[PDB]
Amino acid sequence: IYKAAVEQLTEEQKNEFKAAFDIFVLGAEDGSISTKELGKVMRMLGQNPTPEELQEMIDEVDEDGSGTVDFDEFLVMMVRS
Amino acid sequence: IYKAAVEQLTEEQKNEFKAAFDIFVLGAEDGSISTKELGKVMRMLGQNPTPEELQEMIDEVDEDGSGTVDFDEFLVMMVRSM
Ligand SMILES: CN1CCN(CCCN2c3ccccc3Sc3ccc(C(F)(F)F)cc32)CC1
Ligand SMILES: CN1CCN(CCCN2c3ccccc3Sc3ccc(C(F)(F)F)cc32)CC1
Ligand SMILES: CN1CCN(CCCN2c3ccccc3Sc3ccc(C(F)(F)F)cc32)CC1
Ligand SMILES: CN1CCN(CCCN2c3ccccc3Sc3ccc(C(F)(F)F)cc32)CC1
Ligand SMILES: [Ca+2]
Numbered sequence: 001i002y003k004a005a006v007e008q009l010t011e012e013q014k015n016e017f018k019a020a021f022d023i024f025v026l027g028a029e030d031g032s033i034s035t036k037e038l039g040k041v042m043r044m045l046g047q048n049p050t051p052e053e054l055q056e057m058i059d060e061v062d063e064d065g066s067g068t069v070d071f072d073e074f075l076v077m078m079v080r081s
Numbered sequence: 082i083y084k085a086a087v088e089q090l091t092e093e094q095k096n097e098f099k100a101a102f103d104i105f106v107l108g109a110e111d112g113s114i115s116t117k118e119l120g121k122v123m124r125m126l127g128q129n130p131t132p133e134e135l136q137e138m139i140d141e142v143d144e145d146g147s148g149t150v151d152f153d154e155f156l157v158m159m160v161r162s163m
């Protein structure tokens with residue numbers, strides 16, 4: 001069902017998200033989003049998610065068990081919420 | 082019609098948006114989001130909007146024609162965004 005929504009994205013939408021994804025993984029080891037980068041982003045947007053909530057957000061879309069979110073999984077994250 | 086979705090939003094949702102709105106207008110001369118505050122947010126999220134794109138984004142939800150976005154219009158900007 002979520003695979004569908006992503007596919008329903010236009011080049012414009014995907015590129016917008018890619019630009020956001022890129023700035024988010026700055027200074028990130030594997031070039032992916034971990035709880036650290038996700039926390040920083042949500043806090044700069046005025047939110048204060050707990051370490052548990054951040055891990056759940058990530059585990060929910062971490063299909064390859066990397067413990068991090070790559071762009072493809074990031075798109076599913078966008079889709080969900 | 083986006084007036085419908087705003088109604089659908091839950092408090093927690095509206096509360097999260099308020100927290101965002103509040104951080105976005107820190108420093109705004111009038112507590113509202115002008116092109117300056119919107120541009121900073123867009124850029125903070127890796128985007129690059131022209132001054133015109135920013136004006137248009139504001140205009141789409143500027144019901145009182147203030148040239149700025151207050152919290153109620155912001156909710157519509159969020160809902161609208163889809
Ligand atoms: C308790 N629980 C805590 C988290 N909230 C949802 C936060 C969603 N969110 C958000 C919403 C309003 C204002 C700022 C933000 S930061 C943010 C960043 C990424 C995502 C992302 F990745 F999902 F798209 C979702 C959010 C729901 C309730
Ligand atoms: C179908 N379409 C799916 C995606 N959603 C938008 C998701 C973006 N998003 C979000 C989602 C739910 C609730 C709040 C938020 S605020 C927010 C803040 C940052 C980002 C981030 F990461 F990009 F920076 C993404 C989001 C719109 C409808
Ligand atoms: C020309 N036109 C300009 C705007 N873009 C959409 C921007 C949506 N958006 C967004 C989407 C993905 C990644 C980052 C961002 S920054 C951002 C900041 C605020 C809003 C906010 F306030 F509206 F919710 C919406 C966005 C579409 C095409
Ligand atoms: C369920 N969903 C809840 C709220 N809105 C979505 C807001 C998410 N949002 C957005 C919307 C459409 C396309 C891209 C994006 S990225 C984005 C980036 C920042 C913000 C920022 F900074 F403003 F918070 C909000 C959004 C639509 C319906
Ligand atoms: Ca992963």
Ligand SMILES: [Ca+2]
Binds near residue numbers: 147
């Ligand atoms: Ca206004």
